[PDB]
Every structure is written in C-alpha cells, then in structure tokens.
Amino acid sequence: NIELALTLVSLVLVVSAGPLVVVLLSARGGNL
Amino acid sequence: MEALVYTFLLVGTLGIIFFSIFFRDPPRMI
Amino acid sequence: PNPNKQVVELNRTSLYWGLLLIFVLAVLFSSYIFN
Amino acid sequence: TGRIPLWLVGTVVGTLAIGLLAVFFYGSYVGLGSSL
Amino acid sequence: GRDQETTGFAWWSGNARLINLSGKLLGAHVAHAGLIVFWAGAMNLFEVSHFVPEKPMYEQGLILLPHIATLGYGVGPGGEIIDTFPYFVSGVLHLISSAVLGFGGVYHSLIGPETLEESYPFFGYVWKDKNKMTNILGYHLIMLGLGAWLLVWKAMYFGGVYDTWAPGGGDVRVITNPTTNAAVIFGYLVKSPFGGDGWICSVDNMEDIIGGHIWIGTLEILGGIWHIYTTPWPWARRAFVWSGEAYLSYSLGAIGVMGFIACCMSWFNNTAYPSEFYGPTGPEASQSQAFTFLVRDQRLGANVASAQGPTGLGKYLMRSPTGEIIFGGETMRFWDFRGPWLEPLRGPNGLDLNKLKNDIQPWQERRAAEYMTHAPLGSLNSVGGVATEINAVNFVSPRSWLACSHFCLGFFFFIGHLWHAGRARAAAAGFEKGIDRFDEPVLSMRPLD
Amino acid sequence: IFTVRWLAIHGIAVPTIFFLGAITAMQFIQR
Amino acid sequence: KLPEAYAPFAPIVDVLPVIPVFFILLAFVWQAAVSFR
Amino acid sequence: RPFSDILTSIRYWVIHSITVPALFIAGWLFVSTGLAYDVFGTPRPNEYFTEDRQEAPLITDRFNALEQVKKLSGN
Amino acid sequence: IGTYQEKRTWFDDADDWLRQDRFVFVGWSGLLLFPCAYFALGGWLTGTTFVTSWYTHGLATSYLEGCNFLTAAVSTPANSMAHSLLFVWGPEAQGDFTRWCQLGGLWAFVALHGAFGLIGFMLRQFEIARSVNLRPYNAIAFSAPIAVFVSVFLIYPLGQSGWFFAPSFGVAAIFRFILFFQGFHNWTLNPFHMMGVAGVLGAALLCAIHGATVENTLFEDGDGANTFRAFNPTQAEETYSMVTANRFWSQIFGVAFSNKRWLHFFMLLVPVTGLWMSAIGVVGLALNLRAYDFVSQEIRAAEDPEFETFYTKNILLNEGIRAWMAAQDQPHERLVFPEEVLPRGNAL
Amino acid sequence: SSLWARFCEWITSTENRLYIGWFGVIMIPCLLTATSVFIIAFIAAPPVDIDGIREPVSGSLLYGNNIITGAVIPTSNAIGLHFYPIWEAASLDEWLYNGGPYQLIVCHFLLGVYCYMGREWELSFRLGMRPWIAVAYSAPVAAASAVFLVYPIGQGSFSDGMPLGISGTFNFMIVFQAEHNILMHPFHMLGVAGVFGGSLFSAMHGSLVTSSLIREEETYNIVAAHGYFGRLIFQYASFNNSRSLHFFLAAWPVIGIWFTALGLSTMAFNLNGFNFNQSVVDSQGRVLNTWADIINRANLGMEVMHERNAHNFPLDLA
C-alpha cells in the first residue's frame, strides 16, 4: 500500500498547487 | 370499410389544420 | 324577462380547436371502437 | 467574517465533497456491490 | 484581468472578452495546446504503466497505444507487441513539450502584451482584415501539409506503418508504391456514404491511405501559398461574414463534421484502425461468430452448404441481394464486411465453400473466435457482454469508446456552429442584442393575414 | 439559537452528516 | 509497464492524466477569488 | 445573519469544528460496530442464507408473520 | 374583525403566529406538510441506507447490503400482507421496529406520510395564494401530480392483490414497475397513456419554444452583450416583442398565439390534462381492464398464419416478459417453470 | 431588374403567408415528397420483409392493420444500410416488397427537418430576431436523426430504424431496452428529467403568469407591482429576471433532449447503460438478487422473443 499511499501524497501536492498559486497571489495583492 | 372510415378521419383532421392556417381569423391582436 | 339571460360565444380559433379535438379523439379511439 | 476568504472556504469544502463522491465510486468497485 | 462593466460580457462569457485582445488570445490558444499535448503525454505514460503483455491492447482499454502501434512501433508479426519503450518515449516527449507550450501560453496571458498589432505587426491581426486572415490560414495550411508528408515519409522511410493486410501475415510494411492515380485517390470522395460504397471509410489498402495523404499534403501546402499570396474575391466577400465569431463558427462546423467522420472510421474501418490493436469491428464480430459455428458444426459433420435454416434462407451460407455468396443469419447486413482473416477464403463470387470445406487455416479460426468474444457490445460500467449479461467480463471495445465520444463531440461542436454562426450574422446586422423598440421591422412589414 | 430557520438547518444537516459517515464505513465492508 | 528505472515513479504517472480536468476547476476558483468581476 | 455572513463567521466554524466531526464519526462507528445490522435487522453478509434455508425467504402468513420472519431470519 | 368586530381568540393568536412572515411560510397547512413530508423523505433515506427486502421480495435493496443509488430502493410489503396498512402497532409487526422494517412497513409509512404531505403541499399552495390574493391556478395544476400518485400508488395496488404489486420507492424499482406494465397490461397500447405521453411531450415543446421565442424576441434595453443585465424587476413594458414572435411563428409554423394569457393558460392546461388522462388509464389497469390487443387482428392472425403486424410482434414480446420474470417478480406465486415450457425464439 | 434577382427577392419575401427561403427551396420539395409517399404507404403499401427472412409483415390500412397498428415497415435487413433508390429496384413491386418507401421517406424527411431548422434562422435574420430559436429546434431534430439514421447506421441496417407507426414505435422502444437497457442509461435519465421537469416548469410558469395577467404589461408586472411576491414558496432571486426565467424554461428541456439523443447515439455504438447484474454477492459467493436483476429477467424475455426466426446463432452481436 506504500505505492497507493505515495500516490495519494502526489495527488494532494499536485491538486493543492493551483489553489496555492491563487492564495499566494491574492495575499500579496497580485494581478488575479 | 373500417379503412375508409380511418382515411376519412385522417383526411378530416388535415382539412381542419388547413383552414386553421389559411382561413384563420386575421391576427389583428399582436 | 330573466336578467340572467346571456349568450354563448364561439370564436374562429375556439371552433377550430373544438373540431380538431373531436377529430383527433376519433382518430385515437376509432381503432379501439372497431377493436 | 474577516480573516477568512470565502472563496477559499468554498474551494476547500468543494474539494472535500468531490473526495466523498470519489469514495462512493471507489466502494462501487471494492467490497460490497463490486460484483466480486 | 477584466470586468463585465468594461466588456459587457459576464464571467460565463469571459473568454469572449479576448476577441480583440490578440496578445491574450495567443496565450489562451497556446496554453490550450499545452493541455492537449499534456494529456497526450500523461495518458500515454499512464497506459504504458497500466499495460500488460499477457492481454491484447483492446482488452486493456488502451486508446493511445493502438495509434503508436498502427504507426508501426513496438509491434511484430501478427500484431504481437515486442516492446513498449517506444510508447514510453512518446509520452515523455509530449509531456515535456507540453511544459514549453504551457509556459508560452501563461507568458502571453500574463506578462505578454494584450495586443500584438501595436508592437509585432506580423503577428498583429484584426478580424475583417481578410488579407491578414488568409495569410494566417496559409501558414497553418502549410503546417498541416508538412504533417501529412511526415506520415507519408514514415510510410516509405524511417520504417513503415503496420499493414493488417500484409502478404503472408499482417505486420509493419514500408509503403513503396503509394496510389497517386487521382481517380482512385478522389474516387472515395465521390463514393456514396451508403452501404457498400462506405465513402472514404471504404479505404482498405495502405497504398491509397499514404497516396491520399500525399495528395492532401501537397494541396494543403499549395493552398496555403495561394491564401498567403491571394485575398478573398468579391463573390466570397459578398457571401461570407468577416468576423472572429464567424471565422470560429466556420471552424466549429467543419471540425464537427470531421468528428462524425472519425466516429464512423473507428467503427467501420479496420485498415487505418488495425483490429489487432483496436479490436474487431461490429460487422467483423458478427461475421466471426457465423464463421466460428460454421467451422465447429462442419467438423461435427454438418453440410453448411445445403443446411436450410428455419426461414429456409440458409443456416450458415446464403446469397447477397447482389448475388455474392455470404454468411447466413442476421449477419447478412454485414455482408459487405472485409477482413484479412476472411479474404483468403473468399473469391470472385462471395465466399468459396471449397476453402470453407478445406484450406481453412487454424489462425483464420483462432482470430475469428477471439473477435467473436471481444465484440464491441459493452456497458457504461465496463461490464463486457451483448446485454442482459452477468457482471463477469470487464471490457468495452476501444472502438465503441472512440465512436461514442467523437460522435458526441461532433454533435456539440455542430450546435456550437449554429450558435456562433447565427450570433455572428446577427451581430453584423446589429440586432444581436435585440429589437430597437423604435425600429421594429415587423411593425413596418405587411400586416400579412 | 433555536429559531425555525435554525431548527430546519439542523433538522436535515445533522442527520445527513451521520448518514454520510455510515455510508463511508459501508464502502470499506468486505463480504 | 514503465521502464524499471521509471517504475518507482508509477504513482505519479497514475495522477498525471487527471491534471487537465483540474485546470478548468482552477479557472472557476480564480473567478471566485476575483469575485466574478 | 445572511448564510454567507455565518459561512464567514470563523466562530461558527469553531462551533462546528467538533460537533460536525463527531456526527460523522458516530455514523462510521454505528455501521462499524454492527449496530446498524441489529437495529434494522438487515442481514449481515454472512447470514443471508441459513443452514436450514439456502433460498430467499418467503413470508406467507400475514398474522403469523412476526414468528415467520424471525424463523426466516434464523433468529 | 369578521365584518362585525369580534373578541380575539387563541385561534387568532395561533393563526397570526403560523401565518407570520418567517424564513419559510409555516402557515396552518405546514402543520401537515412539514411533519409528514419529513417522515416520508426521511424514511425513504433510512430505508435505502440500511433496510433489506430479503424477506419481502428476497432482493438486496440497501446501501449497507452494497446497493448503489440506482439499485437501492424501499420495496413494497410482501403480497401476504395484502392491502394491510401494516402499522408498527399493526397485528403483523406487533410493535417490533426491526420486524416492521423486515416486513416492509417503512414502504407503507413513506407512502402514507408522503400522500398526506402532497395534500398539505396543495393546501399550502391555496393558503399562500389566498394571502397573496391571487387565483390558485398553481394549486389546481398540482392536482395532476397528486392524481398520478393516488392512481399509481393507491388505486392500482388496491385493485390488485396487495401493496406488493405497487411502485417501490427506487430508481430500478420504478423501472421494473414500468416493464411489468408493458408485459402484463400493455400500457403503451392503452389510449389514455398515449394522451398522457402527448401532454408531457407537448408541455416540454411549449416550455422550450416559449423560452426560446421570448429570449430571442427580447428588445434591446441594454448597451452590453449580456441581455440578462438589461431587465428591471419592476418594469411595466414587456421585455420581448409579442408582435415579432407572432409573425415569425405565423410564417414558420402557419399559426401563432396572439394572447399572452391564452399562451400561458395553454402552457398549464396541456400538462395537467395529459397527467389526468394517464391516471384514468391506470384506474383501468387496477381492475385489469386494459386495451391489451385488438381481437379483429388476433382472429385474422390465428386463421391466416402468414398475416403479421408490429402489433402481433409486440404481443409475443409481452408473452416473453411475463414468462421470463414471473418466477422472481412474483415469488408468492411460487412458479417453477421448466426451461422447456418457457417461450424462447430460434437460437438466442 | 434581373429576373434571378426578382426571384431571389420573392424567395426572401417576408410578405409570404409562410416565409419561403433558400432553405425552404430544398425543404418544401423534400418534405412534400416524404409526405406524399408516407400517406400512400400508410394506406396501400403491400407487406415488407423487414427481417429479410422472406417473412413479409403486413402494413397500410388496405392490407388490414389500423391507425394504431398501421405503420411504414422499415427497409429489409438484406438491404442493410445500402442505398435502395426506386430506379435501382427492378420493379416498383420489388421496391415495395424490399421496403424502399421507408428509406425514401426518411431521406426526404431528415433533409426537410434540417432545412426547417435553417429556415427558422433565415426568418429570424429577416425579421431582425436573435438567431437561437433553431438551436432549441436542434434538440428534437437530433432525437429524430438518432432514431432514423445514427442508430440504423450503428446497428448496420435501416431495419433497426424506428418504424413510421404507433405500434412500430413501441416495438422499437421495447427491443432497444432489451438490448441496450436504455432505462439504466444516465443520458436517458437526463432526458426523462428534461420532459418531466419541462412539464412541471410549463405548468408552474403558465399558472404564475395566468394568475398574474388574470387582470402588454410584463408577464408578472401585475403581481410585482402589488409586491406580494410568493417568496413564501418562491424564496429565490435567481429567476427574478424574466429573461433569466425564460432562458431556463428553454435550457432545461432542450439540454435534456440533447443528452437523451446523444445517449441513444452512444447506445447505437453498443455502449449500453449501467449493468449491475449479480453485483451484490454474499460471504460464500451466493448472488443476492436486486431490482436490477429483476429488470434483467424481463430484458431476457424480450430478447429471446424479438426476431423469433431471425437468429441462427446464440450471440446477438448484430
């Protein structure tokens, strides 16, 4: 299940990347 | 002659539709 | 002399609707009526 | 209100809802009702 | 970004605010290309990882790998998959390429200028500027011509495409004599779309396919040069709407038709879509079943030739309305089917019972038996089976997936054509927003009835 | 704190949250 | 399957194909932060 | 308070930061404990067919159902 | 008060409180609509979540059993119960919740509470309309849905053996109920169903055509692409051109509405009329009085073997549906049909 | 003035009682052709061997049959998807026996309905109206195309096409479910929601407007002017805009019919609906039947009966 576990880890990091960019940009008054 | 009766009914319905489109009351109202 | 006396009113569209309905209903039940 | 971006709240809650539906489809191919 | 107060378009129509923004529009298109290339690479690597050498690709629900296999990569005699690394290379290449396109799109959507005409005149373009529009079409027309010639090159050089009709067994073959006769190449175009003629879906020889790509490749490149050095003629300007939405509507309508054609190709064609990788076609599966029983019963001791069925129209064999001897049963509808496993047993007049009585090769049987079991029939939950079947087999013909998906895509894009085209025509007239409330044309028209 | 509006909100939400937990556990039961 | 060297990276390739569908979701998220100007 | 105002009140979130989790957990425990099978008499995956009856149960007595269904359920 | 001035009573107090501006209109009807509807829908959820028909229909119908949203369903009680209301205190469950659920009591609970809920909902329509001082056309229109429910979930089950032959609350359950009617009642051939289908298809056509016409004859009352922005909730002038619409349909279809009132009255009459027609047909099926087949063609087909029509072909299909589902669909009948007795066509 | 120009005007003339158009130029003749043959066929057409098993099914009021039973028999299975023009047939009698009229009617009908859609836009552009009325008419046209073309093609025969008759329509629907389980297809479910919902919305909108205009004033201006909005049960502001409401009144039904049409087209490629037969299994492996299994039992009955003599092999791959 190590493969499945690290698979979910990858899914979390990748899925969180898009919101991460928005949150950061919004926080620093970026052009969003 | 049941087929003749059926044909008459079908023809009659079509005839009503005809006058309902060409002999209809002029649509003076919008 | 009944003041309640009134008159029925049938317009062209109403007449067309009635005739269309009576014919369509016949076309629908005619088959079953002749079974 | 305040100190809370409602847009983020929606994005997070929405992500969780997608996850719950995913578990349902997972259960469709696993355990009971999996045809195996 | 942008707001409706300054564009008149709501968030649900935001991309419509990029119509006059050439620079931003470039980023949007470039980015979308990144997404397409990304999936091509990502899904390919996913398929490679989920691929197993103990099962055919069609049984493994793989759609991209069959394409590379048809190009003649990691395949061997009989369509057997020798290696998959070539497929891995394709996924890696597309995936990394998508990154480059993605960066360009993001840049031309953030840092890049909203317009280019002001700075880069060559890229700068204004809808209605027919000359510039035709020039842009020309550039892309040449690109597509080069792409078709790349395929033609792979066919006659750098190896060859897989030929399911290859002599002495199906395998990759380097096309050396591509059909260049216009009558044969353009014959398919004038062929009826009805049964038998099958329009362009009838193409069964790779020679015509490569030769046809030779024709389309040259014409597209020549057409591009023409549109690059010519401007629309008066008749065209008086019979076309010159606007971005109008141009999009034209593309939407065309791509919609192409989608429907692709659906039929995947469902009927077996040459461009090798049954070895894409699985058997609907007609192929039916004919395979008739062949499977015909062979089994004949071995048991049945004369398939004089075997009258319940209707009296022949249990195993019968005559096509045209006269050709065909398999009996409901498969009579697929009498025009042609497969590399059945052709050898056929002759000038339909099937040859002589070959059916003797000369039937074991592979001709094994292949038909496998196709019969892996018919295109399937369910949304991927429960393989004609219908009314228990949940035991997990398989849905890849042909079914492509045929259903591209058909739906074509339908929506056709509806998009109607929406954009009509709106474009109305916009030009000026009544896209609505009636003037003071110049209502109907009020000035005849009172009719 | 317990208005008709509040009562209605918890009249469905509270039961739903429990039901959702039960359905999730059902997705991990093995025959 | 992926080459032996790229085998330890199978989980990642299992998540890559679904990445494109997330982009359209990200668009609506951006509009949400934008408040759908 | 508009639902949006409440959906922004971090206090409301804190108030439901424990109750909502507990409500879900209870639901999971309910099924995991097996209480659901006993509460609704829903046959467990191992008690659908008894040694006596290897076929689906058919209740035939309306006024003698209580005892019949119990016997069919193998008590 | 009461065109005479009267002393206020507790009724007046309760009246004002129930009939009081509130997040949701409680009113007096709500006292029936809110409780019954909650128990009905709630029971359906509880049933589909953790309730089995293993002892009523011998079928797994619960998410706990492993069923999905489509398969899960609250099945009807066993045919042995007949038309028994099957109360929890009834002579069957005898106050046993577990057994009451095993006996299929929840189905009756959901149906009974849901039936009164619909009554309360229609009463709410009249109540709200009376407060708004508007003709309750919406309530009169809600009669068609209620008629369908009563005829399909009450009249039919009562006309047959028991609640067992009634629509079970489930997606797949409704599907098998539909297939059963075709195989046994030939519902499709029934003229009343035909009129009902016409109404539903006709109403859908009216809804789509009306929305398209209005949204396509809208006047330009704004300076932006988005036409939705160019509208005032308290505007007096019509947002669209009835004239332009009339001419378009007068030339495209040959006829067109000229009175907005008549148009909308027609939009509500078509659907209501159709539902009521189908309800009368279901009443006939309850008593097994169905238009199964035309004797004239049946006699001709028997005497003349070659004679054949799609009507005769459909008759054979119905024969298969009944023979290849009766064994399980009707377990009370305990019918064991040897495979040889079952009607099967060549091959297949 | 050039006569061709003069003609072009008359064609685009809005003074015509029924607007003729460039689309009508092809629509009128095609539909007139299909209507004539359909009327003659539904009345005097001789039996047709639809199953291509030499067993001709009787049709037309003359050859017995009735308004309900009567229908235009689909083309013979032998022809399949092959083009069968009257001139290709050796004798008009053969054309009737093989089932040619059906193919001719469908061909002259589909072209007409497509041109009818174009004619709608043509008049809208001539009147100065928005150009999306046809898009709504695209939903019904798409459904007709699937039952009379897409499905016939996917199956590989025009015989599969829905017969032009009441009883024939029912037969087509039954056999379809027996082979595709259309009821368990999510797209058909959307279509049923569209019609059921469309009827609900039509009844409500009609009732609201009627009660309001009960008296040119806006559809609800009256009730709005009073301000006694029924937010008691209509607690919302999404459809406060009449344009917003009417848009939904069109989107809900049209989008639903689009899905059901695509659903039928996908099932035409052998993509049947969800199959959960024997999905629930006990601990030891015994199959616990469900409502789905019961539906399967019926599907089997229709399957074993359809084409009693048109199957020489067990699998119905066709």
Ligand code: CLA
């Ligand atoms: C293929 C999908 C796609 C693409 C390529 C675009 C592209 C674009 N949109 Mg758009 N949009 C989309 C879908 C898409 N959209 C959808 C589905 C909606 C409906 C919700 C909208 C609604 C919308 C509106 C209302 C507007 C745009 C606008 C724009 C333009 C600039 C965006 C902006 O102003 O701020 C940029 C946004 C951000 C900076 C937030 C994050 C976006 C980044 C660039 C995505 C990068 C993700 C990726 C992981 C990065 C890779 C980095 C690399 C190193 C790997 C731009 C060219 C704006 C415009 O120009 O109007 C004139 C505008 O107002 N869009």
Ligand code: CLA
């Ligand atoms: C490459 C093809 C293409 C392109 C470039 C455009 C471009 C545009 N369209 Mg459009 N359209 C297309 C195809 C295309 N369309 C097709 C095929 C259809 C038929 C369904 C439509 C139907 C359509 C309508 C009805 C409308 C537009 C509108 C618009 C404009 C507004 C952009 C926008 O909405 O902002 C931002 C982007 C969005 C808001 C999109 C949101 C994301 C969508 C809704 C989610 C869908 C996901 C989907 C289910 C995934 C599966 C797709 C596929 C596999 C089936 C814009 C310039 C609007 C307009 O006013 O025209 C001027 C409008 O009203 N289009």
Ligand SMILES: CC(C)=CCC/C(C)=C/CC/C(C)=C/CC/C(C)=C/CC/C(C)=C/CC/C(C)=C/CC/C(C)=C/CC/C(C)=C/CC/C(C)=C/CC1=CC(=O)C(C)=C(C)C1=O
């Ligand atoms: C040889 C031959 C002839 C062979 C043919 C044999 C054959 C096929 C026989 C069958 C005959 C047949 C028709 C059988 C069906 C029988 C049957 C099922 C009958 C049902 C009767 C009935 C009373 C049913 C109950 C339900 C019911 C009342 C349904 C009504 C359905 C109905 C009429 C709905 C509307 C249909 C329709 C096309 C509407 C058009 C509306 C219209 C003119 C829009 C224009 C318009 C719209 C706007 O929005 C605006 C703004 C304006 C201004 C405007 O104008």
Ligand SMILES: CC1=C(/C=C/C(C)=C/C=C/C(C)=C/C=C/C=C(C)/C=C/C=C(C)/C=C/C2=C(C)CCCC2(C)C)C(C)(C)CCC1
């Ligand atoms: C503009 C904008 C938008 C968006 C857009 C887009 C769509 C972008 C994208 C872009 C992109 C398109 C991105 C991508 C990226 C990717 C990448 C960067 C890749 C990488 C790769 C790597 C790193 C490697 C991998 C590997 C290999 C290949 C081998 C094996 C193993 C592995 C798998 C690991 C939106 C909508 C929001 C709206 C607003 C604006």
Ligand SMILES: CC1=C(/C=C/C(C)=C/C=C/C(C)=C/C=C/C=C(C)/C=C/C=C(C)/C=C/C2=C(C)CCCC2(C)C)C(C)(C)CCC1
């Ligand atoms: C590769 C190959 C080949 C070849 C193919 C080809 C050759 C294709 C082409 C195709 C084509 C050839 C295409 C084109 C198209 C175009 C068209 C089809 C046209 C259209 C037109 C339009 C759209 C217009 C219209 C109109 C009119 C005229 C009137 C006014 C208005 C308008 C202008 C709009 C082959 C076969 C060997 C097979 C294999 C592969």
Ligand SMILES: CC1=C(/C=C/C(C)=C/C=C/C(C)=C/C=C/C=C(C)/C=C/C=C(C)/C=C/C2=C(C)CCCC2(C)C)C(C)(C)CCC1
């Ligand atoms: C019977 C009875 C009763 C009552 C009971 C009740 C009332 C109950 C309730 C119950 C309930 C109240 C339940 C709930 C349910 C719900 C649920 C279970 C949920 C579901 C959902 C889902 C499953 C979802 C899915 C998805 C979508 C589609 C959306 C979003 C999210 C997701 C994505 C996930 C009484 C007491 C009178 C007594 C006598 C008996």
Ligand code: OEX
């Ligand atoms: O033709 Mn109408 O139908 Ca559809 O499946 Mn195969 O082919 Mn016959 O069988 Mn069952």
Ligand SMILES: [Cl-]
């Ligand atoms: Cl049949």
Ligand SMILES: [Cl-]
């Ligand atoms: Cl057969």
